Amino acid sequence: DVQPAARGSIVDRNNDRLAFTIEARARQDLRQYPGGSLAANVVGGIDWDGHGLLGLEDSLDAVLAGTDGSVRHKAVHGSTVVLTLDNDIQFYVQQQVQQAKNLSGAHNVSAVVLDAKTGEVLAMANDNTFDPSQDIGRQGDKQLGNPAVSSPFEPGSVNKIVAASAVIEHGLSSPDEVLQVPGSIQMGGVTVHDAWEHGVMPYTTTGVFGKSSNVGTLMLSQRVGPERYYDMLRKFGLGQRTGVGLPGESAGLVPPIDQWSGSTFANLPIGQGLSMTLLQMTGMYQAIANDGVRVPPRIIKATVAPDGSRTEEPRPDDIRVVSAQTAQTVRQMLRAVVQRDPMGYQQGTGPTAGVPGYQMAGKTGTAQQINPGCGCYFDDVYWITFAGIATADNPRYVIGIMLDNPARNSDGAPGHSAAPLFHNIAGWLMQRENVPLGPPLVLQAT
Ligand SMILES: [Co+2]
Ligand SMILES: [Co+2]
Ligand code: NA
């Protein structure tokens, strides 16, 4: 005689159930997904035999399924898995991601919300998420996986956090240094232009990152040098799996410095020639949010044994990327990206991401995609990103967004920006916790 182990549940950080089993009959255990598609990218689905088919149902199947007993060997019932997700935040973010996808016309949209201090994954969502309460064979038109961890992209100008962090950390510039930024330069044998044409502009270091000057980024990166720049790429976790605890995580791709060509250093600081996942991208800004200490993100908070005893997941080791002073200085600078100016001069690239009364800080991203037919960049196909911190003066949440080639803003207005989706999510996070509420920053001197 077999005594079957009962499958454990999957719950969010507050024990709100995402997946649980009810007993029924044809002896038939039926998996329940009360939220339908809610976080199904993470949770996954069940197979005909009641074991996991994909997602965490599959990757944690041994934990969740337990071991059948016999009569004597006692049945070891499945343990319950406690995720770091907050279902309230997941539900709002997942809805907003879907409508940002409909409104922008992007091929796909994804977003990640991390706790600023611990790096725990509070929300991880993509558009078009499948429904694990329905048979997977009817859902070829749905997203069955978890692109936020599986599908890397070239960061483009969201990668400029690395250059900014390195020039401040090594004492090579300051936010208010007045620079002289030509409209193009030749570097490493190639020519780099700014996304707008201009003669020599007196951007401050703040303005180089606030206006996203490719040329200004590269001039500053020349002060850093290849070795210190590459070292900082690695400290930020790029090119390495985070170990978040989800199946199918990609490591991204960073060319090691001993394989660089003459043009590599002219490309990497502006986010071309390397790739990262949305989670890695968001993890970078968490380092700066956490006063320079990167905590690799985790989605498994704890497991609860059948006797009800809870064991917390072990916290990952810290990585000191920059000093606390550097991190605080970088957060303040990135406030310029969301700064509005009717006269244009002191406006960053993402003013719609700002939330009045809060010190929102972040960075817009644009990156050309690669044309499969030529092995060369598309002229007009982009990954659009936004990464930000709520808030600069008191980091609580880190939010990362990617839009795959939108035709409009995330809210449907003309343009291509992901900044309004950050506005919606960050502002909602502030209001729902009743977070309580200087002079304008100088991006462009005389
Ligand atoms: Co356009
Ligand atoms: Co608003
Ligand atoms: Na990477």
3-state per-residue secondary structure call for 165-197: HHHHHCCCCCCCCECCECCEEEECCEEEECCCC
41, 148 contact by CB (below 8 A): yes
Point out the ligand nearest to the CA of residue 420: 2
415 CA distance to ligand 1 middle (Å): 5
**Ligand positioned closest to the Cα atom of 426:** 2
Pairing between β-strand 310-312 and β-strand 300-304 as defined by DSSP bridges? antiparallel
Name the residue with tokens 């909602």.
Answer: 428
Question: 276 C-alpha vs ligand 3 centroid, how far in Å?
Answer: 4
Ligand 1 centroid from CA 374, angstroms? 23
- Between the CA of 359 and the centroid of ligand 2 the distance, in Å, is 15
CA nearest 350: which of 436, 429, 275, 423? 423
Closest listed ligand to the CA of 241: 3
CA distance 7 to 285: 37
What is the 14 CA–ligand 2 centroid distance (Å)? 29
Q: Are 415 and 408 contacting, i.e. CB atoms less than 8 angstroms apart?
A: yes
Task: Enumerate the active-site residues.
Answer: 157
> How much distance in Å is there from the Cα of 34 to the middle of ligand 2?
31
- In one-letter notation, the amino acid at residue 46 is I
How many angstroms is it from 275 CA to the middle of ligand 3?
A: 5
Strands 319-320 and 2-3: unpaired
Q: What is the 3-state secondary structure (H, E, C) of 415-426?
A: CCCCHHHHHHHH
Experiment type:
X-ray
Name residue 124's beta-bridge partners: 112
Q: List the alpha helices (DSSP H) in 236-361.
A: 264-267, 278-289, 324-334
Query: Cα-flanking dihedrals φ and ψ of residue 270, to 5°?
Result: -100, 15
Smallest-distance ligand from the CA of 424? 2
Instruction: Look at the chain and count its residues.
Output: 446
Q: Which residue is listed with tokens 């200004």?
A: 216
Identify the DSSP state of 435. Answer: -
Under 8 Å CB-to-CB from 337, ≥6 apart: which residues?
209, 210, 212, 348, 349, 350, 353, 361, 362, 363, 364
Rounded-to-integer distance, Cα 425 and Cα 421, Å: 6
Give the angle subtended at the CA of 159 by the CAs of 158 and 163, to the nearest 5°. Answer: 125
CA of 289 to the centre of ligand 3 (A): 19
Note the ligand closest to the C-alpha atom of 431: 2
Q: Quick count: other Cβ atoms within 10 Å of Cβ 202?
A: 13
Provide the residue type at 283 as one letter.
Answer: G
> What spacing in Å lies between the alpha carbon of 154 and ligand 3's midpoint?
9
